[PDB]
Amino acid sequence: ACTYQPRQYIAPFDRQPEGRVPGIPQYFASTLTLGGYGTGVLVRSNEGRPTKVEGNPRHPASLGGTDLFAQAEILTMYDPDRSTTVLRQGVPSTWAEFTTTLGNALTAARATQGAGVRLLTTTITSPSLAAQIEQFLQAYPQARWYQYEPINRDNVVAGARLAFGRDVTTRYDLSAAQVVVSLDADFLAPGPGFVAYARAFAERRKVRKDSTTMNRLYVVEASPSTTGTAADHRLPLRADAIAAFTGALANELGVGGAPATLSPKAEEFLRAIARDLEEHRGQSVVIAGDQQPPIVHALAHLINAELGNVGQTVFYHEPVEARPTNQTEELVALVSEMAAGRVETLIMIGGNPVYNAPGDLRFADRMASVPLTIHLSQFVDETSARATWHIPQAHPLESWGDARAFDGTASIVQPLIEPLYGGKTANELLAAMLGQPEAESYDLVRSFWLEQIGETGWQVALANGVIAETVAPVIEPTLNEGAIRATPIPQPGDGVEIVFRPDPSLFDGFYANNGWLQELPRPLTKLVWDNAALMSPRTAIKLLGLPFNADRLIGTEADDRERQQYLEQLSKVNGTIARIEYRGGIIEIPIWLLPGHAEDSITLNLGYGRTHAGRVGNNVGIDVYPIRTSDSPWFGAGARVTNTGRTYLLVSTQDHWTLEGRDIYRVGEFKKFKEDPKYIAKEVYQEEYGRETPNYQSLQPGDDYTGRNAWGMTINLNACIGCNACVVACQAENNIAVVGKDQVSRGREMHWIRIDRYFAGEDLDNPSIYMMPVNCMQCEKAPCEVVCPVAATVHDYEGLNNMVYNRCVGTKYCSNNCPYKVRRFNFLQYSDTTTETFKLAFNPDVTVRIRGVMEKCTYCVQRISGARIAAKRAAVQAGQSSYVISDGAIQTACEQACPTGAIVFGDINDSNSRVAKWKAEGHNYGLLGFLNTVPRTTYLARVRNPSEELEK
Amino acid sequence: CHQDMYDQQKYTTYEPSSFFADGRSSRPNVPGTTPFEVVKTDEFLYTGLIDGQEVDAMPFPVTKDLLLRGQLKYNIYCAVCHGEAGYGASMVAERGGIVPANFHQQRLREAPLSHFFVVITNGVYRGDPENGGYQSMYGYASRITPEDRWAIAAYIRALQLSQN
Amino acid sequence: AEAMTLFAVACAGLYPILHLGRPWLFYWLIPYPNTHGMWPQFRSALAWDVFAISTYATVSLVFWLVGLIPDFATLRDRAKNIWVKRLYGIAALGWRGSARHWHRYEMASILLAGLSTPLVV
Amino acid sequence: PFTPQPAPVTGNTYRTYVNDARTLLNSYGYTMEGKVHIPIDRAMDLIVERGLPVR
Amino acid sequence: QLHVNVVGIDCRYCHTSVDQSYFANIPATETCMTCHSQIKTYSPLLEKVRESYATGKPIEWVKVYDLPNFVYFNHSIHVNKGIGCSTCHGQVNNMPVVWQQQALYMGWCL
Ligand code: HEC
Ligand code: HEC
Ligand code: HEC
Ligand code: HEC
Ligand code: SF4
Ligand code: SF4
Ligand code: SF4
Ligand code: F3S
């Protein structure tokens, strides 16, 4: 009641760490794996605790950039639902008891040759684990490995075996690819080598005044994605007709294939693809998606070889996946051995087989046949609950290990903290099965990596983020024409198809407990906390019997606003439950309207419906894995939609999918941009004012900002792909709270940056998608500052917009005057207070907001203050009184996360800075300029490079 | 009368924590973990032994700024309890019977530089396994940077010369 | 009518505090000596609004009480009971309705109305 | 709560040790068992001149 | 007062992180045991210090200078720009028990 503040005790160390300065965060080089392939990350430890993850500039596949999963691994480690103890049968047990039971069980196996012993891991690329598994197989000859995961690359290795007769790894160097063609290949999505491909593609799309060339992207996909956004031409073909499309493409170029009866639009698309190809030989690449059948991969290799792209844009290396194999076939063989009762012991290392296996395999029922089941899941997953001897697994941020990225690099997974709840790694278990219990994970990876690179090599590897000796050698395989020519090449049919796609934020369902990813609005859909059956408007009209024409969305420029109003009226059918019958299964999942979807195709997103997940996501979405089948894991044949009425509430962060004829998004052509980079701005202003220049006049003086630092930001629309990595980075850096689905339904999501798609163009059933990131524009004449009565929002000496939490009384007037609506309010108590692990995840340099205050983008002021203090201290310690900040000294979290490099931050006044050079371009513009706000965050208009045969 | 964001859920530098066993939000160093772009290859930069023995040499050449930094680190950490000029006369030895070592004796005059480095790092001698034992110099590994340790050793040599 | 104004202003005076989200800090909009040195912006309309409602409520209250003083005198003259008296008596301030008092009463009431008209506007 | 006034320190302090030693570290002189003193900030110049063994 | 004015220990011997980070280091039990392993050993006043270092438990000192966590102070920039502890914490060298010399108002920083 008195004394203003309590006692606040302070507990220091008893022995100081040798290399740590208290109050100074440090950085460590580790590796994060997505689908078994590694990604070098630079992770920040504040006082021995991981808090932020950023890119490792020294590591390929992460040249200073990360994906949303690498950013969200921070909160995934701090989940309060992670496993803490060993469970024999749900009973808390010990590690020594499990070791004795494993040794006794393996003694019985020693009487045989391990015939009953079976393994079950995911896509393994770690050399240490692969060497220990091989040693265990030499000790037990009749044992089998059997690796499987729901998001695998079985079609890639199958196509490589069909074409070259051996296992090869295909790498794409997009930096020298003027024409790129994607056959249902979502290479701009989180996958193998996603950051490197997205960076090279973006740097080829960043056009300037002196620029002279620009690459072109062709994509053919069933459901639109991030790759289709950055495409100059997009063809919404069905998922089954893409194999026949590839055959027709190979046939048109004069190479062995098969002609196919296709639509006139697909015929004109084949024409243009073939014409732009053959004119860019060695400057082109054809990419086949992992979802497409093996024949599509083989035909793509053949097309690339004939065009001369091999050795220039397509490179072949030795396999980097340890054992490359058809994982679904090995899973069928394992469940067959389980049904026959041959297996006696089944050891699983992650992957959640009970939830991830296809529905027609009945993994849970056959799992009872094997008496001893053992699992390491890092959570109490569904499989561990139905298994004996559950062993908690150590998080990648608290364990020793290694991994291999695409093209092979063999980076080290360096821990940052002792395991919180204990928990062993995979190689520790493999050493336990090798008669070596109580083996330290440090000594295991250190013993394997020694005697190969040396002690000085291990020290250099820990210092940097890579190992310089390990890289996949370049090989030259031979192509088999007869095998790839004599292939059935399946044709579409059987009616409405189902396309199984990984969820953009949840992947295989591992991150269903992560609040940051579950709340992240999905790209192109903007849904949160839920799962839906995505279908085009025409498909929903025809199949669910909805009373709309779907032809009124077609029109010209004269009736564009009327078509947008009809699309608004049509969006009212979102939420209708549909009883999809695929192959003996009814799913009963609500529907959602995605305009770009191909007709007669429904996209179902994986990773929902879990029952033994954490408190977050414990019962979200409808499980699609039961209807998933082993014969076709990505495509479907025939389905029965069966509309049931019985609406379900779906929640979206935008609720309006069309810009109502305003100057929000600017698009141009490269041929006209070359002659004059300012032509887009000269347009609009003529149609709005009759002149080529808007003579905006203001009544306020503002401030000068001449000899001082002026912080500014530039967003390049030609590089944004909607990967939503900047949003998770902003959440992880600025302690942004996580509200429930109920609070998002009422429009109370808290996000300092948001990406908006606007589905614009003719037809509105085949629309171009425009993604645009929006944060605080930092208006020099900010209207949000002239309305807050307590002066809680003012302006900074450097032109920044100061939003002070402890002064806001919460009038909510600062938001109504914000033209861009980039201010979020704590209507209730949103920040977590009780959970200790979430309190450990908070960034100590940012205050955690309480109920009744406002938030908005602060240009990551903690990093600006740190660099300014460091610059002043370096200036006075040398006796200069200069105080000068380098260009790359400050990097906001959204700038570092972006794998494409679309966000550039720096000093406006320093003319040699990258931002000053970018803002001087002809296509640099600021949103809502008619309001004299003078924003410091500007946009670079999107420039397109379309073909003349398709446009004319 | 307010107490809103005065005490926050985030964990500051030394804020006590009830989630860990020892009641500390700050965490000790992972044994074999090194920071980013910090290579531990050079041994002289981190230990005074080239083959298990002393060398009477210094990893980098002596500089005037290096000697000044060594004098500063000596006056802060080493001068107290052990002598301002290196003779071992201090207020600390008066109360406690510390009797610290005298740098100007002939045994430490012929002693190698790396012997000074390993003494700052570890100490004088740990407790013997039999007949008891105790540490006297107690070491200064965590508080001093290895380069500052070499600068302190260079300043000890300068003090030994200044008294001859 | 004036009683309705005072009660309507009293009811309207709660929403600027209730809608605040951090209501107990409403006095931060008032220029008060603090340990910080912070001032209200005075360039926003909510600072004008604080000064306006405060002036409107205080002037309407003192004008209502000035108009009630003679009625207080007529009530304490008819109150009969001794303890009902001395209550309206101190409210009437011992009005003693006389000349040299009605003159200043009429002129102050004219000035008060001439001042409260641009006030409410 | 007026500002506290701690009791003055007792006579014995470290100041006499530090003053004597720093005075010894200057003004040259002759030591007991040896030949001559050298002031500090001057023997350091001799060290950088004659140098120490490296590598 | 005993450790600075009598024994003569420098402030950076204990708060070693004051000129490098925002946080002035609070001495670990290792720094105390460096001297009290031989000085005044087997004494009641040092029982808590000897109970630590043997066990990992810390010493729960009470913070005298407290900030409402939305202030973000930095010791390094103030020290490197010619600002002494006398103008802020007072004459700490003569305090047998440390007290707050003045309240940390916002106008005081201003
Ligand atoms: C680490 C922060 C500590 C703590 C907790 C204490 N000290 Fe010291 N100390 C030193 C000397 C020379 C004395 C006086 C010796 C004597 O009086 O005979 C002390 C005294 C104390 C006491 C009081 C003991 C008593 O009155 O009997 C206490 C409680 C205490 N100290 C705590 C010397 C040093 C020293 C330089 C060699 C350093 C560093 C410390 N002490 C550190 C600490
Ligand atoms: C040189 C004169 C200084 C100055 C200016 C300060 N210290 Fe110390 N310090 C030591 C210990 C064990 C504590 C905690 C116990 C206690 O506070 O009584 C401190 C604490 C402080 C504070 C207050 C901290 C707070 O939270 O407000 C301050 C302002 C401070 N110090 C400044 C240890 C030592 C020590 C022996 C190891 C030496 C010598 C000094 N400190 C010297 C100084
Ligand atoms: C009091 C806690 C001390 C501090 C401060 C320093 N040293 Fe010391 N040291 C101390 C004692 C009691 C002894 C004698 C130990 C014994 O068994 O007699 C020493 C010893 C040394 C030596 C000699 C080492 C040898 O093998 O003979 C050296 C060279 C030395 N000390 C140097 C030194 C330095 C560089 C210091 C600052 C980091 C320092 N001492 C401080 C006690 C104390
Ligand atoms: C006014 C500028 C200022 C100067 C210069 C300064 N202090 Fe601080 N000191 C503070 C403030 C303000 C705090 C409160 C910090 C907090 O509450 O987080 C503090 C806190 C401390 C603490 C507690 C631990 C911590 O990090 O908060 C110690 C110890 C300390 N000061 C000692 C020192 C030492 C040693 C110096 C070196 C001369 C010094 N001070 C210089 C103002 C200053
Ligand atoms: S700006 Fe954001 S959404 Fe766009 S590409 Fe960069 S990280 Fe992805
Ligand atoms: S974008 Fe909105 S919150 Fe940011 S400065 Fe402009 S008006 Fe204020
Ligand atoms: S600059 Fe910082 S606060 Fe602003 S959107 Fe990017 S990460 Fe978030
Ligand atoms: S109006 Fe001001 S008081 Fe807060 S809600 Fe906006 S910064």
Task: Describe this entry's structure for a reader.
The structure is cut from a larger assembly and holds chains A (952 residues), B (164 residues), C (121 residues), D (55 residues) and E (110 residues). Chain B is an all-alpha fold and 164 residues long. Chain B is 30% helix and 0% strand. The radius of gyration of chain B is 20 Å and the shape is globular. Chain C is mostly helical and 121 residues long. The longest helix of chain C is centred in the middle third of the chain and has 34 residues. With 55 residues, chain D is mostly helical. The radius of gyration of chain D is 20 Å and the shape is elongated. Chains B and D meet through helix 1 and helix 5 of B and helix 1 and helix 2 of D. Strand 1 of chain A pairs antiparallel with strand 1 of chain E. FE3-S4 cluster binds next to helix 25 of chain A. The PDB classes it as membrane protein. Keywords: alternative complex III, Chloroflexus aurantiacus, photosynthetic electron transport chains, quinol: electron acceptor oxidoreductase, membrane protein. Crystal structure of alternative complex III from Chloroflexus aurantiacus.
In brief:
The PDB classes it as membrane protein. The structure is cut from a larger assembly and holds chains A (952 residues), B (164 residues), C (121 residues), D (55 residues) and E (110 residues). With 164 residues, chain B is mainly alpha-helical.
Largest sheet of chain B: none
Strand content of chain D: under 5%
Largest interface: A-B, 59 and 40 residues
Distance between the termini of chain D: 62 Å
Tell the overall outline of chain B: globular
Multimerization status: part of a larger assembly
- The best one-word shape of chain D is elongated
Structural class of chain B: mainly alpha
> What is the alpha-carbon Rg of chain D in Å?
20 Å
- How helical, in percent, are the residues of chain B? 25-40%
PDB class: membrane protein
Keywords: alternative complex III, Chloroflexus aurantiacus, membrane protein
Entry title: Crystal structure of alternative complex III from Chloroflexus aurantiacus
Chain A: Fe-S-cluster-containing hydrogenase components 1-like protein
Key features of this structure:
part of a larger assembly; 5 chains; A: 952 residues; alpha/beta; 4-stranded parallel beta sheet; 30 helices; B: 164 residues; 30% helix; binds iron/sulfur cluster; binds FE3-S4 cluster; metal-binding (chain E); metal ion binding (chain E); transmembrane (chain E); heme (chain E); membrane (chain E)
Describe how the helices and strands are arranged.
This is part of a larger assembly, with chains A (952 residues), B (164 residues), C (121 residues), D (55 residues) and E (110 residues).
Chain B lengths: L63 H15 L12 H4 L11 H4 L3 H9 L24 H17 L2
Chain C lengths: L1 H11 L2 H4 L26 H34 L8 H6 L9 H19 L1
Chain E lengths: L1 H5 L22 H8 L10 H5 L9 E2 L12 H6 L25 H4 L1
The structure holds heme C (4 copies), iron/sulfur cluster (SF4) (3 copies) and FE3-S4 cluster.
Subcellular location (chain C): Cell membrane
Protein name (chain C): Polysulphide reductase NrfD
Organism (chain C): Chloroflexus aurantiacus (strain ATCC 29366 / DSM 635 / J-10-fl)
